[PDB]
Structure formats: C-alpha cells, structure tokens
Design an enzyme around this catalytic site. Structure first.
Site, mmCIF file in Angstrom:
data_model
loop_
_atom_site.group_PDB
_atom_site.id
_atom_site.type_symbol
_atom_site.label_atom_id
_atom_site.label_comp_id
_atom_site.label_asym_id
_atom_site.label_seq_id
_atom_site.Cartn_x
_atom_site.Cartn_y
_atom_site.Cartn_z
ATOM 1 N N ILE A 66 -2.877 7.000 -5.471
ATOM 2 C CA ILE A 66 -3.816 7.647 -4.537
ATOM 3 C C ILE A 66 -3.822 6.923 -3.170
ATOM 4 O O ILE A 66 -4.248 7.496 -2.166
ATOM 5 C CB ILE A 66 -5.236 7.925 -5.085
ATOM 6 C CG1 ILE A 66 -5.741 9.308 -4.590
ATOM 7 C CG2 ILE A 66 -6.213 6.799 -4.727
ATOM 8 C CD1 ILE A 66 -6.961 9.859 -5.352
ATOM 9 N N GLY A 67 -3.390 5.669 -3.157
ATOM 10 C CA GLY A 67 -3.334 4.893 -1.911
ATOM 11 C C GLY A 67 -2.112 4.015 -1.769
ATOM 12 O O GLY A 67 -2.029 3.200 -0.838
ATOM 13 N N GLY A 68 -1.196 4.165 -2.711
ATOM 14 C CA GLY A 68 0.061 3.411 -2.795
ATOM 15 C C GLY A 68 0.348 2.812 -4.167
ATOM 16 O O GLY A 68 1.317 2.068 -4.330
ATOM 17 N N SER A 69 -0.427 3.209 -5.196
ATOM 18 C CA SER A 69 -0.328 2.596 -6.530
ATOM 19 C C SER A 69 0.978 2.658 -7.287
ATOM 20 O O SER A 69 1.138 1.938 -8.256
ATOM 21 C CB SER A 69 -1.512 2.990 -7.387
ATOM 22 O OG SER A 69 -2.678 2.376 -6.858
ATOM 23 N N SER B 97 -2.038 -0.020 -8.169
ATOM 24 C CA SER B 97 -2.585 -0.253 -9.526
ATOM 25 C C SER B 97 -1.568 -0.161 -10.687
ATOM 26 O O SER B 97 -1.881 -0.600 -11.785
ATOM 27 C CB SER B 97 -3.768 0.677 -9.797
ATOM 28 O OG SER B 97 -3.275 1.993 -9.925
ATOM 29 N N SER B 98 -0.351 0.368 -10.461
ATOM 30 C CA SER B 98 0.629 0.449 -11.568
ATOM 31 C C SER B 98 1.385 -0.910 -11.694
ATOM 32 O O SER B 98 2.598 -0.933 -11.785
ATOM 33 C CB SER B 98 1.620 1.593 -11.335
ATOM 34 O OG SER B 98 0.995 2.769 -10.831
ATOM 35 N N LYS C 89 1.736 3.682 -17.718
ATOM 36 C CA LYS C 89 0.555 3.052 -17.145
ATOM 37 C C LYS C 89 -0.638 3.402 -18.086
ATOM 38 O O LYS C 89 -0.678 4.495 -18.641
ATOM 39 C CB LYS C 89 0.359 3.598 -15.720
ATOM 40 C CG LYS C 89 -0.814 3.032 -14.948
ATOM 41 C CD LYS C 89 -0.797 3.641 -13.531
ATOM 42 C CE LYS C 89 -1.930 3.162 -12.668
ATOM 43 N NZ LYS C 89 -1.787 3.689 -11.284
HETATM 44 C C1 LIG Z 1 -3.682 3.278 -6.317
HETATM 45 O O1 LIG Z 1 -3.075 4.266 -5.493
HETATM 46 C C2 LIG Z 1 -4.349 4.080 -7.497
HETATM 47 N N1 LIG Z 1 -4.044 4.088 -8.756
HETATM 48 C C3 LIG Z 1 -4.856 4.959 -9.422
HETATM 49 C C4 LIG Z 1 -5.687 5.500 -8.505
HETATM 50 C C5 LIG Z 1 -6.710 6.413 -8.643
HETATM 51 C C6 LIG Z 1 -7.733 6.576 -7.649
HETATM 52 C C7 LIG Z 1 -8.732 7.583 -7.870
HETATM 53 C C8 LIG Z 1 -8.719 8.359 -9.055
HETATM 54 C C9 LIG Z 1 -7.700 8.141 -10.019
HETATM 55 N N2 LIG Z 1 -6.748 7.179 -9.783
HETATM 56 O O2 LIG Z 1 -5.343 4.961 -7.308
HETATM 57 C C10 LIG Z 1 -4.604 2.382 -5.488
HETATM 58 C C11 LIG Z 1 -3.808 1.794 -4.277
HETATM 59 C C12 LIG Z 1 -4.635 0.718 -3.560
HETATM 60 C C13 LIG Z 1 -6.040 1.206 -3.285
HETATM 61 C C14 LIG Z 1 -6.816 0.461 -2.362
HETATM 62 C C15 LIG Z 1 -8.147 0.874 -2.111
HETATM 63 O O3 LIG Z 1 -8.931 0.153 -1.197
HETATM 64 C C16 LIG Z 1 -9.774 0.690 -0.272
HETATM 65 C C17 LIG Z 1 -11.100 0.189 -0.083
HETATM 66 C C18 LIG Z 1 -11.941 0.759 0.888
HETATM 67 C C19 LIG Z 1 -11.453 1.854 1.648
HETATM 68 C C20 LIG Z 1 -10.140 2.397 1.496
HETATM 69 C C21 LIG Z 1 -9.315 1.793 0.496
HETATM 70 C C22 LIG Z 1 -8.671 2.059 -2.717
HETATM 71 C C23 LIG Z 1 -7.898 2.835 -3.646
HETATM 72 C C24 LIG Z 1 -6.571 2.399 -3.917
HETATM 73 C C25 LIG Z 1 -5.740 3.188 -4.902
#
Ligand SMILES: *[C@@](O)(c1ncc(-c2ccccn2)o1)[C@H]1CCc2cc(Oc3ccccc3)ccc2C1
Ligand SMILES: *[C@@](O)(c1ncc(-c2ccccn2)o1)[C@H]1CCc2cc(Oc3ccccc3)ccc2C1
Ligand SMILES: [Cl-]
Lengths: 547, 542
Positions: free
Chosen positions: B206-209, B185-186, B110
């Site tokens: 961080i949220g399911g990436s 995000s991946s 990534k």
């Molecule tokens: C992924 O999990 C992801 N990929 C990289 C990172 C990351 C985050 C912080 C620091 C370094 N890397 O995260 C994403 C999955 C989907 C997602 C969705 C949201 O949306 C959202 C909006 C408002 C409130 C809660 C969530 C945010 C972050 C991610 C991370």
C-alpha cells in the site's frame, strides 16, 4: 432571489431554440438536394444493416446524418428531448475515419457527456454558460470510430431522478404517451431513440438512469460494470462518491446495436486515452455463444410490488427461455432492504446531501424532484427524529431518511467495507447455484410525469445492481394490455406507504406502453449479459433480429 | 493491562517453535532417505529451470520441497522470517496438478495471505488464536497451478511499516547484515527469498511493502495495479479505505519468476473465484517484446534525497539503457509533496487513525512502529495546533500531521475526487512526453533495524505509485561501494528535519548491501512494466 435562475433559463431556451433552427435549416437544405431519397427505409434499417450500407458505400454518411437529423428535429416537437445541436458535427461527418466500426453513424449523447463548446448544464443554473473545453473520452473514441455525435439530450435537473424535467430546457415527454415520463435520468436519450430520432446513444446510470428511460420508452440499454468504460470528462453534480459505482453505456433499438457500440468503444483508442480503464477487449465468442444458460430469476424483489404488466413480462420471458432449453432457477439476492436502505442510500448520500445541495443554491427546484431537496436540507438531528417517528407505521420511509444523514470518514469506510462484503455475499449465492445470468423484473410501465420523484422506493429493481456493480441491461418484451392495466386497481404495494400509493396511480393509464425485463451477469461479464439480452430479444420479439 | 497480549505472544512463540521443529523433523527424515541428492545444485537453479525439471520429471516434487524446506529452516536461524509451517503442504505436494504452471514449486506467503487452519496475526494480539476458515483466493489459485505454499512469513505489527518486527514473533533481520532491516511490510518474504530459502513468494503493498523488502534484500518484486489480482481472503487491519488501493504481487530472485507467477495467477481459476477482478489474461506478446523504449527518468524526487548509491544505481541504469538504444527522457511526476502529504497520507488516515488504533487496544506497540501510534492517538485539535507550530521550521512534519486528522464523509469524497484528478494529471503529463515507462530511484541501502518507523518521508519513492495506482517493480542493479558509503557522510536531505537526520544515520555501514531501481508503467500495464524490468536486469546483472 430567482433572477439568476430566470436569466439562465432564458439563455438556455434561446440556445436550444437556435440549435433547433440550425437543424431545421440544414435538414431543409439537404432535402431539397435529395428529393428521391427513401427516408423511411433508411430510418427503419436496423443499425447493423445501416453500418454495412455505410461501410460498403451503398449509403453516404450525408444521407444517413441528414435523414436522422430531420427525424430528430421532427420527434423533438412532441418530446422536447433535444437541448443542443452539436454544430461542428457536420465537419466531423466529412472527416469520419472510413474504416471506423461506426463509420457515418449519428450518435445522440446524454447532456452530461462533455462535448467541446457546449454546456453540460444538468438542468442547473450554475452550469449554464460554462461550455466544455474538450470532448470527454468516450466522445473522442466515438469520433475515432467514425461515429457522428449530433445532439445533447435532456436530463432531469441534477440527474438524481428517474423523471426528465429541469427548469432550463423544461420537461421531456414519453413518445408513446405525452402524459408519461420518458424515464431518466437519460430520458432525452430514451425519447429520441424510442421515437426513431437516433439509432444509438450513450447514457449514464448510478441508480437505473440508463435502464429506466430504456424500459419506459421501449428500447434496449446496457449499464456495464462501472469501470468497463471511461468516465473521463463526464459532468456530474457530485464527485468522489465511489461506494455506489456510476457507469456509462449504450442505448439503442436492439441488442446487436448495444454489442456493436461496446465493441467499437472497447478499442486501443479508449485504453490509451484512459489508461485507468482495464484494457478488456470485447469477447465476440462469448457474445455469439448459443450454449444453454443457467438463468437465475425473480418475479418480485419483495420491495417494489411489480405492476401486473411487469409480472407478466417476467413470467412470459421465463417460460420462453425454458421452452428454448435454458435452466430457470429461482434466485433472490440476499438482504435487498439492507442493500437499498443502508448501502445504496447511504452510499449516495453519505454526506447528508451537502455536496449535492450546493448545486441548488439560488436555483429553482424542478417539481419532478419532489421533496428531495427539502428532505436533504433538513438538519441531521431532525432527519434522525422524523425517522424515529415514521419507523412504526412507515419503516421504509424511516430507513431512507435515517440513511440520508451526514457521517464521518470512519463511518464511510465502514459502509464501503459493507458494500464490498455484500458484493461478495451475492457472488457467493450466485456461485452456489452455478448461475450464468440473472433475469429480473424491470420497473414499468412508464410513470406519469412528476411521479418518479414521489416514488423513490421503485428504484429497487435497478439500484441494487449499481450497489453490487454488476452489468445489467434491459430489453422490451411486451406492451401493457387493457387486462394488465385494469389489474392496477388491485395493486397495493408491500408497504402501503406514500411511495406505493404514488406508484399505484402513476403506472395506471398505460395501455400500449412498452414493458421490459432486466438481464444481469457478474462483474466484467458484459458480453455474457448481452448474449442473454440477445436471447431474450430473439424469443420475445423475433422480428427485431435476422429471421 | 497487557495479560491478554502477553498470553497471545507466549502461544505465538510456542506455535512458531513447534512449526520450525516440525520442519526440521521432516527435513532430517527426507535427508536420511536421500543422502545422495545434490541440494546445492537444486537450490541454485533459477525458478524457470526448476519449473522445467519439475515438469519433465527430472526433479521430483518431494526433492524440491524438502530441499527448500531445509534451506528455509537454516536461513530462518539468522533472520527469524518464518512464523508458521503450513502443515498440510506435504498433502498438497502429492496432489499438486501435474499440468499446473507452478507444478511442484514451493511458495512462501506473507502472513496476511489467509491459509486454512492458520492465524493471520499481522503481529496483533487480537488476531492470535483466530485461524482462517479457508485459503484466500490467490492461495487457492497457486494450488490449482500445482504450487506448494509452505510457510507464513513475518510482518511488522499491523503492516503499516517498512520495517519487520511485531511483539508476537519478534524482529526479522536482513540476511545481508543482521543489524539491518529486511524492509517491510513483506520483510519475512524479502529475508527468506533473499537468502535462498524460497524461489517465489507473495507480498502486499500500500506504500511500498513489496518494493522495500525486495530492494533491501536484493531480490525482484512487482506491485501490480491494485485490482489486477484478487484480494479476496487477505487479512488486513483496516477495511473499507478505497482512496489508496492495496495491491498484492510476486517476489522472487529474478524478473522471469515474477512474470511466470503473474501468468500463473491470471487464469480462469482466479477470474471465476473472484469475479470483481477484471479478467485480463497475461499478455505474453507485450512481456516478450524487445522494441526500443521511451523511458522517463528522475535521479531524485526532490523529496527524499537519494543516498549516493541510489543516485549511482539510477544514473548507471539510465546510461546502460541509452547504450542499448532506449530514449531516456527527464521526467518527474508533478506535485509529489501533495501526492504524499495530502492524497496518500489523507487517504490512508482519513479517519485520523481511529480504525487502525482499534487494533492496538490492549496491545504492546512494537518499537519498529516508532511514534506512529502516539501521533495517531492525538486529538484532532492537537494535531492541528502542533502542525501550525511545526509549519515554519519543519513544513514536511507539519503537513503529514495535519493530514492524519479525522474528517467527514463530505471531505473524504473531495479527497477521493482529488486522487482521481491527480491520477489523470500524471497520466496527461506522461502522455505529453510520449513515455512508455518510467525509471526512478528506489530507497536503499537497507536502513538499520527500528529506523524505517522514524524515517516516514523515505516512503516518497514508492508511495507515489500507490497513490497513482500504477504498476511498479524493483530490480537489484548494484551494491554499495566504499565510495558510496563514504559519500553518505555528506548527506543532508532537502528538509533537515528528523526524518532526513535519521536516514543519514540509518544508512551508515552499508558496504556490499544491494541497491535497486524502480520501474513503472501505466495502470494495467504489468506486462510492459515486467518487460522493462527484464531489460534493466539484462543490462545491470548480465
Ligand atoms: C506496506 O505497503 C503495506 N503492507 C500491507 C499494507 C496494508 C495497509 C493497509 C491495509 C492492508 N495492508 O501496507 C507499508 C509500506 C510502508 C508504510 C509506511 C507508512 O507510514 C506512514 C505514516 C504516516 C503517514 C503516511 C505513511 C504507512 C503504511 C505503509 C504500508
Ligand atoms: C440515474 O442513475 C443517474 N444518472 C446520472 C446519475 C449520477 C448520479 C451521481 C453522479 C453522477 N451521475 O445518476 C438516477 C436514477 C434515479 C435516481 C433516484 C434517486 O433517488 C433517491 C433519493 C433518495 C434516496 C435514494 C434514491 C437518486 C439517484 C438516482 C440516479
Ligand atoms: Cl477496476
């Protein structure tokens, strides 16, 4: 309005008095049944030998428990280290798992280790008469290992102190000299173990709280990496602060006891009871290693001028390590003033002290806390202004005061990121010199009672390792000579501010007091830290080990 | 005020174009010299078989490298998953440690995995023309294990997204259907591995990436406990947020590959390079165990209504597990709305998004991010008032909005303590049912492009485990049938707000798209989580 605080002190004192009376009765009942028992021989057995005699059945758990209980009750008379007798322990004694690694071992607990049916007051009126409803995880693991937790020991009020007084149970005194602090915040543990009243105890440490009482009282103590052991069920006066890692760990008469305690705690029972703890078993081969070490060292951190006794303890340990074949390499973690003033201070007081101060509402402020509460209660604008005034003549005081101001979550993230970068920066320095371990001075001799609260700067030697979150332990290596003590008259400190003036007077009149060194290893390297502490103890005090 | 941003995009596109041209040239040259090589046979070999043949000498590292390089180049044509060719990989190829557990294995990375001499843009203009000074720790370890990192793969701008577009490299598309998101995000990793262009990749979550792109693209992915693997040298756009830990982990075609990657990464090299990581070796005995499991399960989290295919995938997997002798126990972590709205949202945006927004100053905002930047930019009093007004009709929208507000360090400590206590609460709940593992639905099928950004609520299935910091992985178990797809027309959601309305439309026309389930174990139980994933894989894809 001090009637609430007075009532809490009256009730706490009645409970402590009743506890001690219950101990006295149990001790007298046992002694009448066992007049021929050689109590001194049992009390002076090193923990490893006591454990072996308990495991074989040579000594009964009753003989061991009641003999230590009698010793704890006696040493408490001159130290006031015990706040509560854990009454149900006699039932635990009869049910102690037979094959447990600590079978029949009485264990003392710092007051903050939640124990069912007992308060964890932290010397605060707001917590008096609020007993715990369950044993914290480490206490459950101690019991599952056959240990018998028997007393709660005293702490300075709120635990944000390296002295040991609170308005509920009063002042704990150093067993070596009544005018001295036993150190803190695990001061009750230091006094109890240091006077022979307990073979093993548990303390906690966010700025040196295991290390100060271990050093001041002449015992060994280890502060592991913050998350090596479970903090589940530990009572604290501030929660959710993660910048400066809190850690829990053993306190005992020798290094082998600390290693046995760590081995017993790092078991499946702990890992299942608290899955948040990485299931890292105790690595025996690392602890037992006799390979030569690359030892980084510093004689001073250039922040807290070492006492003549500290400097000699460090130099002599360094020389004995060199004679033993180890490589001694000068090493100093970079930016110590920044790590203490900005990172540590700011990490502990990111909210300006608001969460901490809530605990003091309507309470007496123990004199051992000095002006900490008065200072923290100041409006942010005034801490900023007073800091600007202090800056030209007293930059250390100005820097602490400025970093004790409240801030946003945005600024806390920035601080947290700086802590992470600082940790990697010291790891990089360590790796560039290919160190195995680090030898440092440890604050000592014990300060006079009521002076730790007025010598904040002196947390420099220990707090740096809470900031870095590295395992760090202390080993007694010498005692203050009259020569070292007369040399305190030439002590000036590096800054010449109030903290240096206090420290100079506070470390005087310390002849015969114990003095330690501090041993450090990288995160998660408790076994290597203990291997090095074992080395120091063997070279400086060979009688403390099998000879 | 987008000149800097326009120039960064022009230079990024030039470098991407030149990288792909360099790949093609290297591939055509190898093919000319080796026209007899069975490229299809090599590409279809499962990673473990590929590794065995590379270790024995049956396949040369050159043959495996250039064959996968050619395939990556070809699949990129319809997916746009590759941002950069890691030039020096041909030098690593020849010097790869012979005894390494990943000897000769091409690995995709990534874009956030720092690689010497390459940008880790994260799709942000501010990071363009800022090459890394060194490889990050995990990349160093992969190389020490003989692996050959060969490409940087695309991410949505800033990575705070489960879609996969940025204004520098553009939009990544799902290899199953071009109108679909590869997840994120991946996303670049998901599209690349999912189309056979890489046998193993690394992602972050961080949220399911890791989980969204693995599920959307029909591949396996594991998000370990946050601190199981080193994050040293990872490029991020927000630093010092520790309430919700970031995790990194493998993505691959099967569970066995994830277990090999973890095993290879959990070595003395990683533990020495990053002492902050607990030195927990890969426990082979836990991973290889075949003991019957007490599997907790839920068909729905009562927050994101599962698509009919998600629900069917979950029920079938549960039934196959019971038939194989496992005990299936109804279980749902308590207080999921609080974990998502308060703890997760609050943890990610404690500062109201100020640190995150710093990255977008003077930049374009990719359409895939939806209104996230516009919402975070709102003054705190306005987020508050708007949340109060939304509360009676759309409580979910109102709760996310109020929790995206800035706060003091005092309030952050309180939130951090609430996260610790919630984690202990779910652990206690789990232990009361004596669970070994937990089986959950996993968001799917893939949403249309530019819809994840408008369906925030759908992170519920994955983000719960970032908040709790439990290892969680995904396994493809089925494909969307005509029936699953027809039933989606009756989908309503539990809230009926904009996020539920979008999800129904975004999941339309998904026949044949892969659907996964999610497997969870307690903190630090990656070996058990993978043992469970292997079980699901054996039963659902025999
Ligand atoms: C992924 O999990 C992801 N990929 C990289 C990172 C990351 C985050 C912080 C620091 C370094 N890397 O995260 C994403 C999955 C989907 C997602 C969705 C949201 O949306 C959202 C909006 C408002 C409130 C809660 C969530 C945010 C972050 C991610 C991370
Ligand atoms: C001990 O390390 C200790 N014991 C328990 C705790 C603790 C702290 C927070 C939450 C739970 N437990 O800490 C103390 C060593 C001495 C000390 C000194 C100071 O003083 C101070 C004042 C102003 C600025 C910097 C330092 C604060 C805290 C401690 C902790
Ligand atoms: Cl950890």
């Amino acid at each position: 309005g001090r009637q609430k605080a007075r009532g809490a002190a009256t009730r706490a004192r009645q409970k402590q008095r009743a506890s001690l009376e219950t101990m006295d009765k149990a001790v007298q009942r046992f002694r009448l049944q066992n007049p021929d028992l050689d109590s001194e021989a049992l009390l002076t057995l090193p923990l490893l030998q006591l454990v072996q005699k308990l495991q074989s059945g040579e000594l009964s758990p009753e003989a061991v428990f009641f003999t230590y209980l009698g010793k704890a009750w006696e040493v408490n008379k001159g130290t006031n280290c015990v706040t509560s007798y854990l009454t149900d322990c006699e039932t635990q004694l009869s049910q102690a798992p037979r094959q447990g690694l600590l079978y029949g071992v009485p264990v003392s607990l710092k007051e903050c280790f939640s124990y069912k049916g007992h308060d964890s007051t932290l010397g605060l009126s707001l917590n008096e008469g609020m007993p715990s409803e369950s044993d914290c995880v480490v206490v459950q693991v101690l019991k599952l290992q056959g240990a018998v937790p028997f007393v709660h020991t005293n702490v300075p009020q709120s635990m944000f102190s390296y002295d040991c007084s609170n308005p509920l149970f009063g002042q704990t005194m150093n067993p070596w000299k009544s005018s001295k602090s036993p150190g803190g915040s695990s001061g009750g543990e230091g006094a109890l173990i240091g006077s022979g009243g307990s073979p093993l105890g548990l303390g906690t440490d966010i700025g040196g709280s295991i290390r100060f009482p271990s050093a001041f009282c002449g015992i060994c103590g280890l502060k592991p990496t913050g998350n090596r052991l479970s903090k589940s069920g530990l009572k604290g006066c501030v929660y959710g602060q993660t910048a400066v890692q809190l850690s829990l760990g053993p306190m005992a008469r020798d290094v082998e006891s600390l290693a046995l305690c760590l081995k017993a705690l790092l078991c499946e029972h702990l890992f299942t009871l608290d899955p948040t703890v990485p299931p890292l078993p105790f690595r025996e081969e690392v602890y037992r290693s006799s390979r030569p070490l690359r030892v980084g060292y510093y004689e001073t951190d250039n922040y807290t001028m070492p006492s003549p006794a500290m400097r000699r303890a460090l130099i002599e340990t360094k020389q004995r390590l060199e004679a033993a074949g180890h490589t001694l390499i000068p090493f100093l973690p970079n930016n110590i003033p920044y790590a203490l003033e900005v990172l540590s201070t700011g990490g502990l007081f990111s909210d300006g002290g608001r969460s901490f101060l809530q605990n003091f509402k309507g309470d007496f402020v123990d004199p051992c806390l000095g002006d900490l509460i008065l200072i923290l209660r100041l409006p942010s604008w005034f801490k900023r202004l007073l800091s600007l005034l202090l800056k030209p003549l007293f930059p250390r005081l100005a820097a602490f005061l400025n970093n004790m101001r409240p801030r946003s979550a945005e600024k806390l993230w920035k601080l947290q990121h700086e802590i992470e970068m600082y940790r990697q920066s010291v790891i990089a320095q360590w790796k560039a010199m290919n160190l195995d371990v680090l030898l440092t001075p440890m604050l000592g001799p014990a300060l006079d009672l009521n002076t730790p609260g007025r010598a904040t700067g002196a947390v420099s030697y220990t707090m740096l390792y809470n900031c870095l979150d590295f395992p760090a332990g202390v080993v007694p290596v010498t005692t203050v000579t009259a020569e070292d003590d007369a040399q305190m008259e030439l002590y000036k400190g590096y800054f010449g501010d109030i903290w240096d003036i206090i420290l100079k007077k506070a470390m005087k009149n310390s002849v015969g007091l114990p003095v330690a060194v501090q041993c450090v290893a990288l995160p998660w390297q408790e076994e290597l830290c203990l291997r090095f502490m074992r080395e120091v103890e063997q070279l400086m005090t060979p009688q403390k080990q099998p000879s």
